[PDB]
Structures are given as C-alpha cells and as structure tokens.
Design a protein around this nucleic acid. Structure first.
Ligand code: MG
Lengths: 419, 452
DNA sequence: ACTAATAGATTAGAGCCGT
RNA sequence: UGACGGCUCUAAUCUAUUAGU
C-alpha cells in the first residue's frame, strides 16, 4: 500500500537538509523514499521514481529552494506529483518545504504557488514541528520500529519553543520596605559630657559618635539615666539634619558628606532592629559575619504561628527558622530579611559544632521548597509585626521607624506551565 | 509593584547553521558545529582503571536511558551525536602500577607527595608524546581514589600547569566516577548516585572529550558584533594578586573566538584586587592586538566585565591605551546580594531570565532559576540573582543584560542548559587557578582545551 | 605618618552537603 | 577532579571616625 513519503530535492546541495530530514522522519517511523538514500545502483531510476510516485507515495515533500525550482529533474517529479494528486483526490499531497532564505513566495512555480508551504527558512526544528502537525492532522500512518527513539525524538521536536507563557505572576521578595522614619537626624555633642570611649552600644537607643557628635534620631534629653548630666546638655550644640533630604542625596554638607550619613543611618537601622529584638525577646545566634534571630522552643504557641511552624525538629535536634535582617538605602530604603535554619538538640542551646549545624542545615534545606521558604519567612515577620500593617523601630523617646510587615512584591509578565 | 523585564534566551549555533537554546538538544538533533574525524584515547592508570575506561567508552556509544527521560534529554550515543568515532580499542595505555603509588604515598612532606604524584603521571604522558609514534588526541588520567584524598598544592591544579609547556590536552577522570556502580560507602548504595543522571554524565564527558580533541560542540551568535567581551578575575597568591583575562568576540566570518588573554599580572599592593597602571596597560593592549589580528580592525567598544569594581587609575590606564572610536564598558557581576523572589502560588522557583532594572546603571538578573525546556531546575531552591552594575562607561542597562546572559552559553566543561555566572568569568577563574599552581611560564597557551 | 578600636561595604578564599 | 548549585566558616582590603604611638 502507498505508505511512503517521497522527497524531491536538488541533486548537489539539498542532500544535507534532506539527509537530516530523511533520517528524522525514519526515526519517527515515517517511511521515506529519497532519490539518493533509497535508490538502488544500476536501476532505471525514472522507471522506479515515476512508479513509486504513482504507487508508493502517500505524501510528497518538496525541499523548495532557489535551485530546486529551476532544476529540470525535480519539476518532473512535481509534474507527476500533481497528476497522482488529482486521482488521489487529496489536496494535501504536495508540501513545498521552503528552506532557502532568499526564496520568498514570489518566484515559486504556479503549480506549488497555490499550495501552503512549511517554513524552514529560519529554523529547521520548528519547521519540522510544523510538518509533524501537518502529517498528524492528516493521520499519515507511521510504523514503530524503535518505540523509545520515536517517542523521545518526538518530544524533543515537540518541546522546542514552548514554556514561555505571557501570564502575569506575582513574586514575594525578602525585601521589606521601610514605611516610616524620623523626620530629623541629630548630632549630639555629648562629648563634653561623654566619658572617654563611653561604649555607645550600651545606650537604650542607637547613637554613633561621628567625630565628636553622637549621630542619632533620639531626642537630646533621652539618656538621662544611662548617661549622667544629660539634661545639662545645651540643645544648641545639637545639629539638626532633615532625614528625607539625606535619602534624596542632597545634603552634601561640608561637615559630613552625604554618603557617610546613609551608612550611619544603616548602622543606626541595623542596631535599632537588634535593639527591638531584645524587646521582642527573640533568641539570637552569632554567625560568621552576621547576627541570627529565632524563637526558643515553647515560646511560640505550639512552636508555630500564622499556621506555620517557625520552630521544628530534625534528627536529634530542633530546626529553627533563623533570620538576619540587614539594612539598605540604595535606591529604595529596604530592610532585607534573610532565611536560615538553626538547630538545637534540647530546643534551647544550639549545637556548638559548626560542622554539625552546617551539615544539618543542608539536610533540612533539601526538605523545604520555594513555597515552604515563602511561608516560613512571611510567618516569621508577621509574628514580629507590632502594628497590623507594620512594625516599628524605636530610635528615641518619640522617634520611631515603622517598616512594612509585608514583603515588597514584584510583578512579572512571563510565566511557565509550573507542572 | 516593581515590574520585572524578561530577557530572551540567546541561541547557540550548531551544525548547518541551526539554532537551539539547549546544547543537549541542538547537539542531539543537529550535531556539533564542526566535526572531528575521531578521538584516539590515551589512558594513564592502573589495570583496574583501564578496564573501567574501556567499559565506559564502549558504554556511551549506544543510547543511554535515565529514569527521567521527559525532563533531561537522553543520550543518543557518542557517534550518534557528534558523528566521530571514539573507540575503546584504540587506547594507548600507559600503565601506572599500584605499588608505584605506595612508595610515593609514604613520603613525609606533603610538597614532595603531591609533586611526585604529578611527576608520575605527566612524565609517562610526556614520554609517550615523544617516543610513541601514536597520535594520541586526549590523555585520560583515570586516577585511583587513593590519589584524591590521601594526597590532600593541589594534585589536579599542579598537573595541568606543568603540562602547559608541552601543550597536551588532558581529561582527568576519577575512577569513582566511571565506575560509580562499583564504589559504595559500606551501605551498598553508591557514594554518588548517577542512576537518574546517566545521560547527564555521558553528555558532559563526551562534549568535554569532544572539545579537547579539537571539536567545537557549539558556538554563540547572539552578541553585538565589534565587541571584545573581556573578563577579569583576581586570584590570591601567598600579598600577591594575579589577574588573568578571557576574551570572547565574533570574527569577520561570524565566528566566536573564545580564547584567553592571560598572565599573572601581579599586584603586590596592600590594596587588593586592582591593577597597577603598568600591568593594566599590558592586559588591555594584549586583547586589543588579539582582536586586531583576528579581525583586522580594532574593536569599536570593549566590554570589560569582572566580579570586582574598577578604581580610577587602572581605568585611566585603559583609556590611555584605548584607540580612538573604541568605547569602554565596565561591568561588575557579583553573586552576594540576597534578593530572593518567592513565587506567589506553586512549588517551582522563579523562571530563569527575569530581570529587575534597579536603575539606569544597575540591574538584578536571574541567570539561575527554573528552566522550562529542561523541566528540572539546575538549582534546587530559590535562586539568588546576580547583581550587574555598569561600573564605568556609557552602555545600555538592557543591552548589557542580554550580553551577560549571552556569555552564560559557552560552558564547554559541562553541557548544562546555562551557567549561573558568565563563563568568561568562570574560565578565567579556572585559568588563574591552573597557571599559578606552578612556576611562571613565559607564555601560557591561549586554548582553554589545556585548562578546562 | 604609623598601629589600634567601633562599624558598613566588598572582596576573596577555604570548607561542608545537595542535585 | 563529569558537573552544577547552595551554604557554611574564616580572612583580608577599602571608607569613615576616634584613640594610641
Ligand atoms: Mg573539565
């Protein structure tokens, strides 16, 4: 029966394309007759070319090119192809596969000009994907010589340009933009009243002694108990600076360059976050270059909050969702909240062995997934939400830094099947 | 709401000018860009290693099935993909007796231990490259596992640098890799399970062997012409810094000339990771001449990228030696800033290619993420993006993002979908690791085939 | 100038597991 | 070192400030 796909092409150059085309179709199980790959030597080729076009061919594929349409021996296969098409009452018989870049549907012979071509000019894999759609639509039967190769090669062709959907998607970051911040940043000259090398870290509110000025948002007479003779200070020596002006990068004062001010603000910001943690009473954990935070076993209700177990157990220890918030001002002031997994054998003291924790951290990590990490982090900050829509950072008696308790959300215009 | 732009995946060429986005697909469907006649193997190892190597090379001639055929493509077979022959019966075997390892193994000094083992393997290779009339293509050193961990100033790094003066491609294969079924940690299960990634393993070794034998498995075509993408990496030497460079650019015939432009440009300065005016001028001059000879005309801009920022004086040196009409772009690509974008609903991480334009001179680009075609992330969890900032020069922050993603498609040491960092910053890292692992060679080879 | 300290910054390296 | 990714532990440099020599 006619169950063979004939291929016509120019003799010298089309071989490369046709050879790849012929083998792929054979590998898919499509029976194929090529004038160079299946023509026995010494045969009367027109006798067998004509005969099989009439009798053996069920599809006719023409490798269309700038010379394959000017080749006398190819049009003869076309001319008989049209005739056998007529008797077979199959309009979808001749499929003029266009491969040449310079051939664009305006020098094609009238015989195939009425027909719908399959485009290979830009990419052979997609053009062959078009053919498989065309052949499968017409229910062209193909055998299954090696079923595994046929299915696999079909999938390789099938999934060539796919997986980029135009659907919008929303991404939850670990960035938490600051909502509020003090209006005025103040340099206190408590120097005259400050003990030599008075630890500035012991203060209730964050204050950095830039030069001889205690850079802080805190109100002047705030550290009355902590710092003696605080009230004796004169507010004249305090240097008021508009905070929003710094964040705009416009306060290029000779006294302090703008760049240094933000780094102090971040220094204040990170310290204030740490100071708030003691108020929130979260157990901390030193790191290689950072400071960890988490909730002790039993502190949180069932060691879970917002339907998320911030505290769990792995092996002989207890895994704890660790965090290390870091401040950033460029370009949008944001307090990044990271994600970690600390481990405690009794649920309280953390395994001192760094090797055991790090090995444990990886074992726990290979369990949590994108969604799980999102749930754990957002539940953690939600527990830290002072307000129902933010959490503040006390930097003074009446100065506060509200920061959005929800993470900054990014929007993208491309998604995938997400199987 | 911050909007993320999407960077389209650049295409890597294959046979017949055909383009595909996955090297594992464009190779399987279309084949390598340029074919070699065949690969003549050479094995330097124990009798056990030679049997394993002969077993594995014969194994990968035929198609290989991994459990997850849907996601990561199967391996059609070496001759089926690359078109050349890689026969295990043409092995120019050079035996290394296990007892010979023992006497070197027992030396007290670690310096003498690693040097003698390196001298053990390379001497047999070097002699067999001067006395034997066999044209060996790639020398495969099936090293026994005792070499790896008893000898632990690196065996692998020392070996490659000492063979540079002879220009001998080598491909070190640990015996635990080729015979993974036959190495278990007393549990009965392999020390590393390659069962689900057999095709992934066979893909990587084959293209590495194919590349080192003079083959070009694929090349890039999605870059702006007339640009010399030069990548700089600094290595600590113990207060010495060495800064090798790797360049990638199109020739006149639209061919990527992915070569090095290397040397230990030393920085004995207290401030680290920068270049003196003298050293910096030589570095950029070399790449300029290399493009000059490879193309005839000078580049119209030089896309200098690095993981470290550039100060003024070294940038000034670049300006002084730069010819007229040539622009400079300084790009700093770091993988440190934590910007984790968890997907709203689902379990598959953010798709690769998303980009956050922070401003006109910086961006966050997701080179690692979820790849749809492979249907299985090269990563496992939420991927950290790489921060790309235009340190110096005038360039488009969107065009730079495309080029940076483009440079992630020339990893020949593995046939993965794409690499997290641009390969020019990864290959220059490998070169600096290799070069400095021994004495200063007057002229290093510029073919990555001798390093990767 | 040279050291020391408190920071954020920005780099490197080691190394320990996943896939 | 078939590879890749993540993470950990260190370390140094640069900047600011003060102290000290
Ligand atoms: Mg390699």
């Amino acid at each position: 029966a006619r169950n063979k796909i004939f291929i016509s092409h120019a003799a010298p150059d089309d071989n490369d394309f046709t050879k790849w085309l012929a083998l792929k179709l054979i590998a898919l199980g499509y029976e194929v007759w090529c004038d160079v790959l299946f023509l026995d030597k010494g045969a009367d080729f027109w006798k067998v070319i004509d005969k099989e076009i009439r009798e053996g061919a069920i599809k006719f594929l023409l490798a269309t090119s700038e010379i394959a349409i000017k080749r006398d021996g190819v049009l003869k296969e076309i001319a008989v192809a049209e005739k056998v098409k007529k008797q077979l009452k199959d309009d979808n018989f001749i499929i003029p596969l266009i491969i040449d870049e310079n051939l664009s549907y305006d020098d094609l012979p009238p015989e195939i000009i009425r027909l719908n071509a399959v485009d290979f000019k830009k990419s052979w894999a997609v053009g062959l994907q078009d053919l498989l759609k065309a052949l499968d639509d017409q229910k062209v039967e193909k055998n299954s010589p090696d079923p595994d190769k046929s299915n696999a090669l079909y999938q390789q062709i099938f999934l060539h340009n796919k997986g980029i959907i135009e659907r919008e998607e929303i991404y939850d970051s670990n960035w938490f933009s600051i909502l509020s911040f003090p209006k005025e940043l103040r340099f206190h000259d408590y120097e005259k009243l400050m003990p030599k090398g008075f630890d500035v870290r012991e203060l209730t509110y964050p204050a950095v002694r830039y030069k001889n000025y205690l850079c802080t948002f805190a109100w002047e007479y705030d550290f009355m108990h902590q710092l003696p003779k605080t009230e004796t200070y004169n507010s004249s020596q305090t240097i008021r600076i508009p905070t929003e002006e710094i964040l705009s990068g416009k306060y290029d004062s000779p006294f302090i360059g703008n760049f240094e001010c933000q780094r102090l603000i971040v220094q204040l910001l990170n310290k204030a976050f740490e100071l708030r943690m003691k108020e929130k009473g979260v157990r901390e954990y030193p790191m290689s270059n950072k400071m960890g935070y988490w909730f002790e076993k039993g502190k949180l209700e069932k060691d879970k909050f917002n339907k998320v177990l911030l505290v769990g157990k792995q092996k002989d220890k207890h895994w704890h969702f660790g965090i290390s918030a870091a401040g950033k001002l460029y370009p949008f002031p944001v307090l990044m909240i990271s994600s970690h997994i600390f481990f405690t054998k009794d649920g309280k003291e953390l395994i001192e062995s760094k090797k055991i924790q790090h090995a444990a951290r990886r074992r726990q990590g290979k369990n949590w997934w994108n969604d799980d990490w999102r749930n754990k982090l957002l539940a953690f900050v939600k527990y830290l939400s002072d307000d129902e829509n933010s959490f503040y950072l006390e930097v003074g008696s009446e100065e506060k830094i509200y920061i959005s308790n929800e993470p900054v959300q990014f929007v993208g215009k491309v998604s995938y099947n997400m199987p | 709401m911050k909007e993320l732009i999407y960077i389209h995946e650049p295409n890597i060429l294959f046979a017949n000018g055909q383009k595909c986005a996955d090297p594992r697909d464009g190779l399987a469907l279309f084949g390598p860009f340029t074919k070699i006649y065949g690969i003549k193997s050479g094995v330097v190892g124990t009798q056990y290693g030679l049997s394993i190597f002969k077993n594995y090379i014969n194994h990968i001639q035929k198609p290989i099935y991994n459990a997850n055929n849907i996601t990561r493509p199967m391996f059609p077979g070496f001759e089926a993909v690359f078109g050349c022959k890689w026969d295990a019966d043409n092995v120019v075997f050079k035996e290394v007796t296990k007892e010979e390892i023992e006497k070197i193994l027992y030396t007290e000094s670690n310096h003498k231990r690693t040097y003698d083992l390196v001298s053990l393997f390379i001497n047999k290779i070097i002699t067999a490259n001067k006395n034997e009339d066999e044209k060996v293509d790639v020398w495969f050193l099936v090293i026994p596992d005792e070499i790896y961990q008893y000898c632990r100033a690196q065996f692998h790094d020392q070996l490659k640098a000492r063979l540079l003066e002879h220009t001998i491609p080598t491909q070190i294969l640990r015996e635990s890799t080729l015979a993974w079924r036959d190495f278990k940690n007393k549990f009965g299960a392999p020390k590393r399970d390659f069962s689900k990634i057999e095709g992934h393993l066979a893909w990587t070794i084959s293209t590495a062997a194919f590349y080192k034998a003079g083959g070009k498995p694929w090349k890039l075509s999605d870059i702006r012409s007339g640009v010399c993408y030069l990548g700089l990496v600094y290595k600590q030497i113990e207060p010495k810094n060495a800064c090798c460079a790797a360049q990638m650019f199109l020739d006149n015939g639209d061919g990527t000339v992915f070569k090095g432009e290397v040397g230990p440009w030393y920085n004995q300065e207290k401030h680290e990771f920068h270049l003196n005016p003298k050293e910096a001028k030589a570095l950029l001059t070399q790449a300029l001449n290399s493009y000059k000879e490879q193309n005839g005309v000078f580049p119209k801009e030089i896309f200098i990228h690095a993981k470290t920022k550039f100060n003024g004086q070294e940038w000034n040196a670049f300006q002084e030696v730069t010819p007229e009409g040539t622009n400079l772009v300084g790009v700093t690509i770091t993988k440190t800033k934590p910007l984790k974008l968890f997907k709203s609903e689902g379990n598959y991480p953010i798709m690769r290619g998303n980009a956050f334009i922070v401003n006109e001179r910086s961006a966050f680009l997701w080179t690692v993420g979820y790849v749809p075609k492979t249907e299985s992330t090269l990563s496992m969890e939420v991927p950290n993006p790489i921060f790309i900032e235009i340190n110096k020069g005038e360039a488009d922050i969107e065009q730079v993002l495309k080029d940076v993603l483009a440079l992630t498609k020339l990893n020949y040491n593995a046939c993965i979908y794409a690499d997290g960092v641009p390969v020019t910053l990864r290959f220059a890292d490998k070169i600096g690791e290799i070069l400095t692992a021994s004495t200063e060679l007057k002229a290093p080879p510029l073919a990555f085939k001798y390093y990767i």
